[PDB]
Amino acid sequence: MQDTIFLKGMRFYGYHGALSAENEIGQIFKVDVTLKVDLSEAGRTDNVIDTVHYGEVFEEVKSIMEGKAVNLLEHLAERIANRINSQYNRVMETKVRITKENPPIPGHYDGVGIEIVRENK
Amino acid sequence: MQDTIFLKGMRFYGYHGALSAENEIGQIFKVDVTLKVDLSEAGRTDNVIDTVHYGEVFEEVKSIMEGKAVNLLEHLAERIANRINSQYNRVMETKVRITKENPPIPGHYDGVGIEIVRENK
Amino acid sequence: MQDTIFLKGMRFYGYHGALSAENEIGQIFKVDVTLKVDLSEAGRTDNVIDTVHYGEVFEEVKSIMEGKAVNLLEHLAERIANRINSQYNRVMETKVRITKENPPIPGHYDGVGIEIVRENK
Amino acid sequence: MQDTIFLKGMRFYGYHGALSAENEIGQIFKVDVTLKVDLSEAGRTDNVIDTVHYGEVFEEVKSIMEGKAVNLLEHLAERIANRINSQYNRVMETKVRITKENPPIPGHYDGVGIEIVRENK
Amino acid sequence: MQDTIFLKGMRFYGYHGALSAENEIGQIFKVDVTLKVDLSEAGRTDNVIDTVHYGEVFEEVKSIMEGKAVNLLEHLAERIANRINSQYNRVMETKVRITKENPPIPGHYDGVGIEIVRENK
Amino acid sequence: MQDTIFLKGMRFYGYHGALSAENEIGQIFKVDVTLKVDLSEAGRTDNVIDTVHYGEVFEEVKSIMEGKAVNLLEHLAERIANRINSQYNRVMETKVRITKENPPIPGHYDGVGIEIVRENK
Amino acid sequence: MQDTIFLKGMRFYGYHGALSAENEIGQIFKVDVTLKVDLSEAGRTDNVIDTVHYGEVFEEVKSIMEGKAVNLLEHLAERIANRINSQYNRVMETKVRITKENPPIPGHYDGVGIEIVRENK
Amino acid sequence: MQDTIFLKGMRFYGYHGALSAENEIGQIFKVDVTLKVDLSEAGRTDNVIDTVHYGEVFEEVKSIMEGKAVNLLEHLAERIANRINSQYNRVMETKVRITKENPPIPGHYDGVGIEIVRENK
Numbered sequence: 001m002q003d004t005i006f007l008k009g010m011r012f013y014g015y016h017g018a019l020s021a022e023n024e025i026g027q028i029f030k031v032d033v034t035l036k037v038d039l040s041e042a043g044r045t046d047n048v049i050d051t052v053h054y055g056e057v058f059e060e061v062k063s064i065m066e067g068k069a070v071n072l073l074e075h076l077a078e079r080i081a082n083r084i085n086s087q088y089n090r091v092m093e094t095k096v097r098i099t100k101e102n103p104p105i106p107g108h109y110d111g112v113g114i115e116i117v118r119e120n121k
Numbered sequence: 122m123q124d125t126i127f128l129k130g131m132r133f134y135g136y137h138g139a140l141s142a143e144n145e146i147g148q149i150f151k152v153d154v155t156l157k158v159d160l161s162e163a164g165r166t167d168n169v170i171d172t173v174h175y176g177e178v179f180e181e182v183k184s185i186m187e188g189k190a191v192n193l194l195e196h197l198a199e200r201i202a203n204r205i206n207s208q209y210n211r212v213m214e215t216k217v218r219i220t221k222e223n224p225p226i227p228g229h230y231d232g233v234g235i236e237i238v239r240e241n242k
Numbered sequence: 243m244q245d246t247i248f249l250k251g252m253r254f255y256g257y258h259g260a261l262s263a264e265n266e267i268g269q270i271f272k273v274d275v276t277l278k279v280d281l282s283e284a285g286r287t288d289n290v291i292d293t294v295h296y297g298e299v300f301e302e303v304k305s306i307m308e309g310k311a312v313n314l315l316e317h318l319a320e321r322i323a324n325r326i327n328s329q330y331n332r333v334m335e336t337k338v339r340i341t342k343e344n345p346p347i348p349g350h351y352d353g354v355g356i357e358i359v360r361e362n363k
Numbered sequence: 364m365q366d367t368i369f370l371k372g373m374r375f376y377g378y379h380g381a382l383s384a385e386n387e388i389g390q391i392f393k394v395d396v397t398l399k400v401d402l403s404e405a406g407r408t409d410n411v412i413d414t415v416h417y418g419e420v421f422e423e424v425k426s427i428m429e430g431k432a433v434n435l436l437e438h439l440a441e442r443i444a445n446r447i448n449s450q451y452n453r454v455m456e457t458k459v460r461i462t463k464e465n466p467p468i469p470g471h472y473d474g475v476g477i478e479i480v481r482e483n484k
Numbered sequence: 485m486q487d488t489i490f491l492k493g494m495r496f497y498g499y500h501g502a503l504s505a506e507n508e509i510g511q512i513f514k515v516d517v518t519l520k521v522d523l524s525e526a527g528r529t530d531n532v533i534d535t536v537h538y539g540e541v542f543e544e545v546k547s548i549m550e551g552k553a554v555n556l557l558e559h560l561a562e563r564i565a566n567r568i569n570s571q572y573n574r575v576m577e578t579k580v581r582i583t584k585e586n587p588p589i590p591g592h593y594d595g596v597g598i599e600i601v602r603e604n605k
Numbered sequence: 606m607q608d609t610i611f612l613k614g615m616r617f618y619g620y621h622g623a624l625s626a627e628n629e630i631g632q633i634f635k636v637d638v639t640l641k642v643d644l645s646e647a648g649r650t651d652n653v654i655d656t657v658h659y660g661e662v663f664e665e666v667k668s669i670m671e672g673k674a675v676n677l678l679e680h681l682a683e684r685i686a687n688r689i690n691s692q693y694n695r696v697m698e699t700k701v702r703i704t705k706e707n708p709p710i711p712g713h714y715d716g717v718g719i720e721i722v723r724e725n726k
Numbered sequence: 727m728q729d730t731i732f733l734k735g736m737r738f739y740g741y742h743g744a745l746s747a748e749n750e751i752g753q754i755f756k757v758d759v760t761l762k763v764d765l766s767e768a769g770r771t772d773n774v775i776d777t778v779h780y781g782e783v784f785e786e787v788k789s790i791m792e793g794k795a796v797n798l799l800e801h802l803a804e805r806i807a808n809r810i811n812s813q814y815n816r817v818m819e820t821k822v823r824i825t826k827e828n829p830p831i832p833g834h835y836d837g838v839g840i841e842i843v844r845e846n847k
Numbered sequence: 848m849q850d851t852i853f854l855k856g857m858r859f860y861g862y863h864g865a866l867s868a869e870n871e872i873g874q875i876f877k878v879d880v881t882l883k884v885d886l887s888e889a890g891r892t893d894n895v896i897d898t899v900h901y902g903e904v905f906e907e908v909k910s911i912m913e914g915k916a917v918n919l920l921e922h923l924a925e926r927i928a929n930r931i932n933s934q935y936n937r938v939m940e941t942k943v944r945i946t947k948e949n950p951p952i953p954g955h956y957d958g959v960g961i962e963i964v965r966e967n968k
């Protein structure tokens with residue numbers, strides 16, 4: 001079952017980070033959420049009720065990325081995956097990738113971050 | 122057997138979507154189709170008849186992405202995969218990814234979408 | 243063993259294609275070659291003789307992509323993989339991806355193509 | 364366990380290479396480091412002490428990419444993976460990808476390079 | 485008066501070109517149209533009737549880029565500028581840039597093309 | 606006097622547009638604001654009080670792009686330029702460019718929009 | 727007279743440079759050539775004989791960028807502009823921009839280079 | 848005299864900024880330096896001594912962008928232009944553009960910055 005619903009490159013300005021200066025000025029956070037969902041039912045019916053509505057998922061990601069500040073990307077991603085898994089039983093597994101394209105690191109790079117994969121129980 | 126024929130970043134303007142406003146103005150839809158096909162025969166013969174002609178596949182994708190409007194990306198992708206699997210027995214599995222780079226979602230992101238994988242029976 | 247030597251986005255102007263008009267004007271062909279090679283020996287010795295020299299591989303890819311014209315990307319990729327596998331015993335598997343970013347297809351897309359994976363016997 | 368901490372597109376100017384001319388003028392080296400780390404502990408605690416701090420990892424990559432010159436990308440990557448595995452027991456596997464976007468190769472391409480994956484024992 | 489209405493990167497698949505092979509397979513044509521129009525009236529009134537509607541302009545560009553085939557980009561651009569100048573008296577000057585990103589030229593480049601500027605009399 | 610302070614590629618999700626469907630779903634608006642300001646005073650003193658603070662300008666652009674909906678880009682740009690000219694006497698001329706990368710237009714293009722230049726009296 | 731014929735982002739691998747190491751390994755050179763040519767004649771006639779054929783210009787640029795090695799970009803650009811001005815009387819002014827995206831400079835940047843503008847006498 | 852020597856997209860990590868938090872963590876600064884220099888002498892002689900060596904200019908830009916911290920981009924740019932004008936009499940005018948792609952601004956944008964043009968007396 002390799003069917004998925006995805007939201008790529010979501011960007012939210014937030015104040016997450018371990019260092020107080022970054023909690024102070026903030027930065028853009030890029031998020032990729034991929035969901036394992038069997039889309040064969042919606043595929044035949046064309047009824048939105050038989051799949052996971054991506055607009056709602058975005059709202060969920062937004063609510064966490066733009067809510068209270070946390071020290072780690074790991075924790076934000078854990079909160080996001082848990083949020084999605086809890087409210088959508090059709091989702092079998094949630095993968096969340098959060099990239100800091102401009103973190104507090106003296107150097108030249110495209111980005112740093114984390115990715116976690118969590119099955120829905 | 123990890124041989125494939127691919128069509129990346131196809132873009133079609135369409136009126137698909139669950140919300141009537143988007144069925145009204147439309148938007149660009151980006152499609153990636155990857156096909157599992159054993160290319161060792163064509164690889165030795167150099168005869169187009171022994172592989173799946175990518176131009177034809179494109180025509181198939183186009184016909185669906187630019188035809189009648191549907192509510193979900195899941196359904197468009199299901200129609201595409203089924204179309205390709207039905208007409209090309211050499212295709213062992215069809216993966217279709219459809220991305221909405223600018224869907225009806227208030228925010229900043231690179232894209233949202235779905236991907237399904239369907240073996241040809 | 244997930245060690246690799248890679249050459250990404252190689253571009254050669256060539257006259258390959260099934261339709262005579264394209265054999266006539268040509269186009270750019272983008273090639274990605276990934277090689278499964280155990281790099282632990284070179285990793286400790288730092289001697290180029292214990293790994294596969296990427297410059298040589300490029301020469302091999304170039305010689306095929308810029309040589310005689312063929313009808314299919316499948317056949318070019320098969321010739322490339324076979325070339326690399328034959329001359330480099332350290333290579334355990336050769337993956338070749340060839341993309342036509344601007345093929346003879348009326349539409350909007352980022353690219354179409356094929357990818358094959360061939361183990362060295 | 365598909366949880367990861369990543370650092371994408373790090374870029375360092377260095378003098379690594381087999382040919383003396385390139386050891387002489389140098390070039391930019393792009394590095395991607397992906398780490399297999401269980402982030403469920405940090406995910407619940409929000410304490411940086413329970414995950415691998417990405418800033419430190421960067422420092423490690425930097426120290427190698429910008430230190431003494433070596434002939435092969437394989438060797439730089441082997442040194443990086445070994446460095447990370449040695450100092451971070453929470454890391455279960457280190458993947459390092461080093462790309463030379465502008466190596467000593469007469470042609471047109473996006474990049475050439477290597478990728479290795481090393482589990483921490 | 486440095487006010488403008490612009491349409492950047494329009495892309496149309498067409499069969500324009502001096503060589504019969506290219507009139508045969510076609511290619512994508514990228515068009516940039518910039519219009520010198522005093523926008524102070526619309527700027528205060530917020531009524532679409534006091535400015536040049538960009539949607540209509542696009543229709544005009546489309547009609548030419550996707551209509552009958554011509555040998556030169558110069559001629560397509562001349563037809564476009566004349567079309568816009570004739571139907572929109574508010575337009576004081578029309579600049580049209582047409583780029584062939586993949587013309588019949590053996591080599592490596594981002595694009596070739598022409599740009600003309602025509603005042604409306 | 607060719608000194609400038611600039612803010613490139615600002616992006617705001619808004620509901621501006623002449624067609625009610627677009628006022629309904631919205632889209633991203635990209636804004637470039639360039640300001641003619643003599644920076645020789647700040648250049649020698651290094652005191653923020655002698656130049657125009659770019660953070661404040663952004664706040665001004667944001668307030669308009671994210672406030673009440675209007676039919677035309679011309680009007681949004683006129684409001685922005687007037688806002689900046691009114692509150693910053695050091696600004697000699699304000700140029701505002703607003704691009705709709707995904708407007709209600711059936712086709713393939715990079716963007717459409719307007720640019721106005723307004724001197725401060 | 728703001729009409730132009732352009733060739734953007736041409737790329738040639740060459741061995742130009744003041745330092746012997748770079749004359750030894752080479753690098754990619756990106757060239758932009760813009761030509762001031764009145765296109766109103768070709769614009770009405772649609773005959774290639776009344777404009778400057780861009781394919782030929784490319785051949786000229788290629789012949790210099792890929793011929794004998796020189797120390798400076800200034801000199802390559804001077805040779806190119808002079809070549810174009812000499813053979814095409816319809817060309818009123820030739821602008822040549824040559825960029826070294828990866829020159830012998832320890833640092834992070836997108837490119838360095840020169841641009842010259844030469845009227846045809 | 849529209850001849851120029853340019854250095855585009857130089858990137859340096861620095862601690863410049865008016866707010867103490869940003870002086871603390873830093874960020875990447877992108878710099879474009881364009882120089883008005885008559886290149887006809889070097890164009891005929893091919894001797895580096897008759898033009899301005901771009902490598903040296905880079906060293907100058909680097910020394911300022913990576914040296915002592917200042918509050919404003921205006922001041923950094925003023926120091927750079929003055930540095931270049933003082934040491935290179937062949938330079939008739941220096942244009943410096945400094946972009947902060949990720950400044951302390953809550954929002955979505957590509958960049959903010961300043962550009963100054965200074966003739967050499």
Ligand SMILES: Nc1nc2c(c(=O)[nH]1)N=C(CO)CN2
Nearest residue numbers: 005052053054055139193194
């Ligand atoms: N997974 C998913 N969610 C959606 C979809 C869709 O096609 N798939 N379409 C929508 C209409 O805007 C809204 N939400």
Ligand SMILES: Nc1nc2c(c(=O)[nH]1)N=C(CO)CN2
Nearest residue numbers: 126173174175176260314315
């Ligand atoms: N899979 C596949 N399809 C094709 C190919 C090709 O090389 N592979 N070449 C074509 C010639 O334009 C047309 N169609």
Ligand SMILES: Nc1nc2c(c(=O)[nH]1)N=C(CO)CN2
Nearest residue numbers: 247294295296297381435436
């Ligand atoms: N796989 C591989 N091939 C190479 C390498 C290298 O580091 N790895 N370095 C080279 C020096 O330019 C030349 N060729």
Ligand SMILES: Nc1nc2c(c(=O)[nH]1)N=C(CO)CN2
Nearest residue numbers: 018072073368415416417418
């Ligand atoms: N893996 C990891 N390392 C970090 C993180 C983080 O969120 N994850 N946050 C930091 C604060 O800048 C510093 N270092």
Ligand SMILES: Nc1nc2c(c(=O)[nH]1)N=C(CO)CN2
Nearest residue numbers: 489536537538539623677678
């Ligand atoms: N010049 C111009 N043309 C338009 C504009 C606009 O803002 N400016 N808005 C439209 C609404 O989609 C349609 N057409």
Ligand SMILES: Nc1nc2c(c(=O)[nH]1)N=C(CO)CN2
Nearest residue numbers: 610657658659660865919920
């Ligand atoms: N024009 C301008 N505005 C600013 C500047 C600056 O350097 N120039 N620096 C700031 C510090 O974040 C804030 N605002």
Ligand SMILES: Nc1nc2c(c(=O)[nH]1)N=C(CO)CN2
Nearest residue numbers: 502556557731778779780781
């Ligand atoms: N300036 C110019 N040169 C050309 C043109 C063209 O349209 N303009 N078209 C060609 C056909 O490939 C060949 N050469």
Ligand SMILES: Nc1nc2c(c(=O)[nH]1)N=C(CO)CN2
Nearest residue numbers: 744798799852899900901902
């Ligand atoms: N303006 C300028 N400066 C240079 C040039 C060049 O061609 N032009 N070439 C160099 C050789 O690396 C070094 N420095």
